[PDB]
Design a protein around this nucleic acid. Structure first.
Ligand SMILES: [Mg+2]
Ligand SMILES: [Mg+2]
Ligand SMILES: [Mg+2]
Ligand SMILES: [Mg+2]
Ligand SMILES: [Mg+2]
Ligand SMILES: [Mg+2]
Ligand SMILES: [Mg+2]
Ligand SMILES: [Mg+2]
Ligand SMILES: [Mg+2]
Ligand SMILES: [Mg+2]
Ligand SMILES: [Mg+2]
Ligand SMILES: [Mg+2]
Ligand SMILES: [Mg+2]
Ligand SMILES: [Mg+2]
Ligand SMILES: [Mg+2]
Ligand SMILES: [Mg+2]
Ligand SMILES: [Mg+2]
Ligand SMILES: [Mg+2]
Ligand SMILES: [Mg+2]
Ligand SMILES: [Mg+2]
Ligand SMILES: [Mg+2]
Ligand SMILES: [Mg+2]
Ligand SMILES: [Mg+2]
Ligand SMILES: [Mg+2]
Ligand SMILES: [Mg+2]
Ligand SMILES: [Mg+2]
Ligand SMILES: [Mg+2]
Ligand SMILES: [Mg+2]
Ligand SMILES: [Mg+2]
Ligand SMILES: [Mg+2]
Ligand SMILES: [Mg+2]
Ligand SMILES: [Mg+2]
Ligand SMILES: [Mg+2]
Ligand SMILES: [Mg+2]
Ligand SMILES: [Mg+2]
Ligand SMILES: [Mg+2]
Ligand SMILES: [Mg+2]
Ligand SMILES: [Mg+2]
Ligand SMILES: [Mg+2]
Ligand SMILES: [Mg+2]
Ligand SMILES: [Mg+2]
Ligand SMILES: [Mg+2]
Ligand SMILES: [Mg+2]
Ligand SMILES: [Mg+2]
Ligand SMILES: [Mg+2]
Ligand SMILES: [Mg+2]
Ligand SMILES: [Mg+2]
Ligand SMILES: [Mg+2]
Ligand SMILES: [Mg+2]
Lengths: 271, 46
RNA sequence: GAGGGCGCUUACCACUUUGUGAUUCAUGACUGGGGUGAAGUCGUAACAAGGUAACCGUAGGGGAACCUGCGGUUGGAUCA
RNA sequence: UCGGGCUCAUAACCCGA
RNA sequence: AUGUUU
RNA sequence: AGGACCGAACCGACUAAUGUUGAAAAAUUAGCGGAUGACUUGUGGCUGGGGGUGAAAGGCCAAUCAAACCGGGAGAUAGCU
RNA sequence: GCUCGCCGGAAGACCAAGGGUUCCUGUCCAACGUUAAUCGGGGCAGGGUGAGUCGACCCCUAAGGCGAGGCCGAAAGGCGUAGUCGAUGGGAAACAGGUUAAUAUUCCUGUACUUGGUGUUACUGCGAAGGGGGGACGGAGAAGGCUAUGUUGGCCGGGCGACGGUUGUCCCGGUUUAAGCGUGUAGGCUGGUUUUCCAGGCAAAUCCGGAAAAUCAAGGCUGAGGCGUGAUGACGAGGCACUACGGUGCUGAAGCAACAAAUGCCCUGCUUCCAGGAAAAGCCUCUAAGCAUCAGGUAACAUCAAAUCGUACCCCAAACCGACACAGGUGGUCAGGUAGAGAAUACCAAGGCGCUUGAGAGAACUCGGGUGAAGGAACUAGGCAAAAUGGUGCCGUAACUUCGGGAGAAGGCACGCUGAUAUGUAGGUGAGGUCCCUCGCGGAUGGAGCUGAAAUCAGUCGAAGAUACCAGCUGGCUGCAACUGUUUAUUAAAAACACAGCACUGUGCAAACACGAAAGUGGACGUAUACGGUGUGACGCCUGCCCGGUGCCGGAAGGUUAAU
RNA sequence: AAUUCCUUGUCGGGUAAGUUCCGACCUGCACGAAUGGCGUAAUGAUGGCCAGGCUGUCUCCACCCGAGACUCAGUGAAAU
């Protein structure tokens, strides 16, 4: 559920929260945690590598089973948690053999539901299955990319990949982006839309929200001086340049894409 | 006003102490040069 | 002495003052529309099937009447 | 622009210079 | 298209 | 609840007077802004010079920064004084 | 030595960082001290820093650093695995009193505690670089309980007053007591114990996870404080003696209660929110390799040990950073009284101080102040600076508005003292006495005593009752930016930057991008509701035409065109 | 107009008088749509203007309390 705040103070007036009741409250499941440590966008050289990174809350890591094995063993999802390290939401799951794990959290999610993965596995929202045994048209969660690897496509709140054809020993997939891309078919993948989707509607509302979220401000190129960034200068405002990156690298449609080593797998580019 | 030299011996020893000097090709070279000048205190100690 | 009067004091209370509001009348640089006028200038929207049938409401566009979409009505002509 | 024509007649339109 | 004249 | 209100500490530094061989190589004094936050601070760590860092002023990088300091090439050159 | 003044959330008192003998005692004064100097943080001598339990080493880990081999690199060397270091963070133990010219949770007295070896004696499956558990954690907020701590009375010791009064509802002072041990409360949390079964916990496990039945309702962790004990003591005004007038012995009263009360403690709790909130060891338990009369495990008691190094002094400064005994800078801890909302402020206590030139004079002028006739912004670039406002409760309060606001708008009224209601009220706290009871850190009933605002009425003094210090001036029109925020440390704080929101645009993950000749690494343990680039800059109403030029995107048919 | 040169444009308002301010005109030397346009409650140590209060800011100074300045005594500089 999304909520508007009363304007008892500018900077709250525009806030729009997304508060989910069916979320667990308080500390997570201890054993599936581990350190994290911020990086200030900085290198192993100590150099800022990616700008705008730093500050923001503490953040301990939830393991989150991406491969989805435990074939045959069923599990019952005890609860849905909040994970600070993704837009997605989290399911604490518990298998019949007495083992707990974290799983993403489909659209249907819901504590009490039953879950299972493997070649057998019934096609039901929330289950994992090599795509070879998955009706063409299904909508499917976090999709592996190499059979076995981990799943990487459609991991984000509201995302989902539609299977559009499975000729050959490969499947063609309509990613969220628009692109259509073949993949190994023996490749795992969970049933259903990834959860939440209300994400999209948050508003933040004041600079601090992003601040306490690890996003330091961005200073336009025009604001600076000729010696810092390819833009900037001119007595007042101005521009008269050819829109480029601070390293003079040209912008505004240049693609940069360059693989050849993976072209094959791309059947039709986004638009 | 708050001046530039705020003392701290941990740091002092870590930035310009004997071993830090001893820990890198050029550091050692700093020692060489000084010993060759006949300096009485290579590095600063107890 | 008692009683009264004057004086003083208290209560009510007209002027009068201070603040901030409602409200009505006159007026105001400029300015929207509306009414009336003799032959002006531009086109010709409506009237006949008015030469894109007309209108109502709504919205967008345009020197102008008006154009265009959307739905609705017939207060529409033909043997369609 | 000018002369001729179409029109009841102006314009448009057509013709000739 | 107009005629107190596109 | 609040980058909410008033207001000490603490962070700042808008005005004025003084000072300007100062008490001080940037202060004092009377006022001033913020003050649960993009808050403020101790210790320790990382980034190194055409490079870092910058809510961007060419601001900051050990009292100096349109390219630091130290040594070296070096007795650079100087149709100038 | 007697007075006078100054700070008292410091100008006191402790700690760290830093200094590094400034500490204490003699002695000296050239130089150092902005003067003198007999005095000093000066000179010279001599003295002084006592630990099982305070700190450090040590155990453990963070960010980060190093790093056998290894991967890269013309060389130098860059990176990194096993590891190994690294505190600002986790890990066992002591309190009060006394003492020295100077040390003391270190010496001394008193009274405790920790963990290991040995020994003896009873009882017993012990055992890992390993599993689980624990350690282990955010923000804000709301009380309840409690202590530190204070007031008053009671108590005790002393006093009966330089000038009217003062044997009393009078005056002064003190009224202190730790760890540890016992109890295990206010209160917080969680249902227990049993047996059996298993595709998990890199192997096993009697552990943790999961599944079944069984069977009990009270059980188990947690926990400030109070009380008892420590205390037969210590401390304690003051006595009485000696004094080399510094002090040294010996001695010692009272030592309670009620009330108030933190920002500390119960509380790493509780309620709740989103930004979702270290690691590892010690520790508890679980097995394995194994040892199986052993050894080890438990407990009581006895004994031995607990090294080493730091320990003076300064500390919001004359001892540190500032060239100075420099109006600057500098992290943590404590928090008495009266008044007060208070860590503001004003006066004091304790404690420390009057700032290392002094003495006179009492001009202009300058500095910093106090008061001002009439006038009151005429001054001036400009009301710069002054002067003014200045508390609390209540009444009351416009346009506009994003319905919060604007508003502390504005503007008014009350404000001291005494008496009364009421020899001190509503409230608070709360003992006897009474009863009960799962019996006591119980409950119920009881309302003594102790505490104590506010209100109305009557009365009263002054020029004036928020009386000092403290302590918003208010109102109308308009530009710019929505706003909190940031910036030129040292002439600019702004209308500049940033911002939430908006758009364009790139990127399919070995991503685009970025640091790096590379290995590696950031992006991201993320994955198009994400991440980078650019412009715009809340929100409302909106964002038209132009693709010629430049830029960018797609396109090949031809013309041209490189090495070859 | 943070943009208007001509410019103290012109009219209205406020003033005893107003190169500023406010409202208007539009002839925009040389606004205008994310180089964002035009609005906008709140906010601002923000630029411009007006009013009450207040005043030594002033007409126009006066007195007074402190620190220097002046005399004595010790030390004892500087720029040039
Ligand atoms: Mg941005
Ligand atoms: Mg600039
Ligand atoms: Mg510039
Ligand atoms: Mg310009
Ligand atoms: Mg009118
Ligand atoms: Mg018509
Ligand atoms: Mg028609
Ligand atoms: Mg129609
Ligand atoms: Mg605030
Ligand atoms: Mg100040
Ligand atoms: Mg404030
Ligand atoms: Mg500098
Ligand atoms: Mg040089
Ligand atoms: Mg040369
Ligand atoms: Mg030379
Ligand atoms: Mg002398
Ligand atoms: Mg001394
Ligand atoms: Mg000495
Ligand atoms: Mg090696
Ligand atoms: Mg390395
Ligand atoms: Mg270690
Ligand atoms: Mg430490
Ligand atoms: Mg001492
Ligand atoms: Mg033994
Ligand atoms: Mg473990
Ligand atoms: Mg008490
Ligand atoms: Mg007498
Ligand atoms: Mg008494
Ligand atoms: Mg000491
Ligand atoms: Mg001095
Ligand atoms: Mg000082
Ligand atoms: Mg004070
Ligand atoms: Mg006067
Ligand atoms: Mg004048
Ligand atoms: Mg004037
Ligand atoms: Mg002023
Ligand atoms: Mg004043
Ligand atoms: Mg203006
Ligand atoms: Mg602003
Ligand atoms: Mg400046
Ligand atoms: Mg400034
Ligand atoms: Mg972005
Ligand atoms: Mg802008
Ligand atoms: Mg446009
Ligand atoms: Mg005037
Ligand atoms: Mg104007
Ligand atoms: Mg513009
Ligand atoms: Mg703008
Ligand atoms: Mg501000």
């Amino acid at each position: 559920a999304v909520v508007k705040c009363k304007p008892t103070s500018p900077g709250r007036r525009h806030v729009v929260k997304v508060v989910n009741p069916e979320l667990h409250k308080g500390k997570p499941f201890a054993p599936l945690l581990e350190k994290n440590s911020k990086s200030g966008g900085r290198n192993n050289n100590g150099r800022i590598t990616t700008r705008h990174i730093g500050g923001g809350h503490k953040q301990a890591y939830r393991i989150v089973d991406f491969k989805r094995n435990k074939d045959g063993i069923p599990a019952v999802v005890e609860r849905l948690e909040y994970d600070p390290n993704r837009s997605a939401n989290i399911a604490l799951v518990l298998y019949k053999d007495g083992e707990r794990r974290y799983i993403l959290a489909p659209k249907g999610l819901k504590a009490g539901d039953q879950i299972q993965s493997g070649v057998d596995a019934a096609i039901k929202p929330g289950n994992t299955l090599p795509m070879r045994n998955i009706p063409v048209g299904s909508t499917v969660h976090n999709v592996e990319m190499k059979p076995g690897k981990g799943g990487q496509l459609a991991r984000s709140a509201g995302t989902y990949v539609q299977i559009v054809a499975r000729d050959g020993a490969y499947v063609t997939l309509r990613l969220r982006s628009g692109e259509m891309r073949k993949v190994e078919a023996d490749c795992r993948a969970t049933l259903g839309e990834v959860g939440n989707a209300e994400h999209m509607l948050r508003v933040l509302g004041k600079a601090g929200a992003a601040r306490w979220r690890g996003v330091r401000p961005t200073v336009r190129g025009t604001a600076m001086n000729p010696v810092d960034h390819p833009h900037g200068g001119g007595e007042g405002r101005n521009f008269g340049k050819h829109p480029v990156t601070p390293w003079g690298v040209q912008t505004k449609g240049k693609k940069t894409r360059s693989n050849k080593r993976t072209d094959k797998f791309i059947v039709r580019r986004r638009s | 006003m708050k001046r530039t030299f705020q003392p701290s011996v941990l740091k002092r020893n870590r930035s310009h102490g004997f071993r830090a000097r001893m820990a890198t090709k050029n550091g050692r070279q700093v020692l060489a040069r000084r010993r060759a000048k006949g300096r009485a205190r290579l590095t600063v100690s107890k």
